């Protein structure tokens, strides 16, 4: 509350650390469905169904231009990429499996880097 604060957690490396995580997600062999925005002209149903499209290149540009206020808003966009994937792709598909694999990969790196 006013003039009553918990001890200050050091957030000065968060930007660099999120960038490193994002590099590792970018270079994973199962990243290919997530590298670029889904082409809304060429994928029937995507535009109407997926209310907030998100992809790694869009996260990279947001990160590089100071559009994440804190590390949690960064995680929310990464998770959005996988939630969108699950919404549109069957679990038993190459892309569906890719999304589950990348979500797992991400959540481990997230815990190990920050928790």
PDB file of C-alpha atoms in Angstrom, residues 6-14 17 71 113-114:
ATOM      1  CA  UNK A   6       7.755  -5.654  -0.627  1.00  0.00           C
ATOM      2  CA  UNK A   7      11.519  -5.887  -1.289  1.00  0.00           C
ATOM      3  CA  UNK A   8      12.500  -4.859  -4.921  1.00  0.00           C
ATOM      4  CA  UNK A   9      12.978  -8.017  -7.183  1.00  0.00           C
ATOM      5  CA  UNK A  10      15.771  -7.187  -9.702  1.00  0.00           C
ATOM      6  CA  UNK A  11      14.074  -6.903 -13.140  1.00  0.00           C
ATOM      7  CA  UNK A  12      17.040  -5.208 -14.939  1.00  0.00           C
ATOM      8  CA  UNK A  13      17.967  -8.374 -16.909  1.00  0.00           C
ATOM      9  CA  UNK A  14      14.389  -9.419 -17.816  1.00  0.00           C
ATOM     10  CA  UNK A  17      16.581 -12.927 -20.644  1.00  0.00           C
ATOM     11  CA  UNK A  71       8.016 -10.091 -18.250  1.00  0.00           C
ATOM     12  CA  UNK A 113      15.061 -18.716 -15.855  1.00  0.00           C
ATOM     13  CA  UNK A 114      12.702 -16.851 -13.467  1.00  0.00           C
TER      14      UNK A 114
END
